[PDB]
Amino acid sequence: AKHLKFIARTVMVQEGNVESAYRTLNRILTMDGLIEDIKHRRYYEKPCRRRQRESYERCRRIYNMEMARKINFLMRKNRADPWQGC
């Protein structure tokens, strides 16, 4: 309200590609967490539910990264069998 306008969350259109500018703006707002914040602020989330959700997402991310690391580490052995037959 007290800030200068047309600086925040603003994307310029290149060669009349308005759809591309909109999709870039959507990507920016989603990456900065603004979209999920707006969607979550429509109704009040109770503090206990918020803490449970944050813990769940944190542990989900940790577990997913660890499983991805394990799969990538064990993917090296997936080559042609060098001792076929024996």
Partner: protein, 96 residues
């Protein structure tokens, strides 16, 4: 026997990794530095997974940013356009 191994700290121990701001002072008046860790479009403070800073310097940067914002040194809703052409130190790409 002279060839037996001797007790010793690892001489090949590599120096422990450092963050880009380690050993440097973070001041709330240095808006140019604090602007390198905020989103150009929203002014939101980047997390450590993007900035790559350590916990101590991440906290220092956060506190300095809040102090500068509330004391009338830094904008809140966007990054100052004067610092848009500064070196990029954050691991984030909008394909923009």
């Amino acid at each position: 026997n002279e060839d037996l191994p001797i007790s010793m700290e690892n001489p090949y121990k590599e120096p422990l990794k450092k963050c880009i701001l380690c050993g440097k002072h973070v001041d709330y008046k240095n808006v140019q530095l604090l602007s390198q860790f905020v989103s150009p479009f929203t002014g939101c403070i980047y997390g450590r997974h993007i900035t790559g800073l350590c916990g101590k310097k991440q906290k220092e940067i956060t506190k300095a940013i809040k102090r500068a914002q509330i004391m009338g040194f830094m904008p809140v809703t966007y990054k100052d356009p004067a610092y848009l052409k500064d070196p990029k130190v954050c691991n984030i790409r909008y394909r923009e």
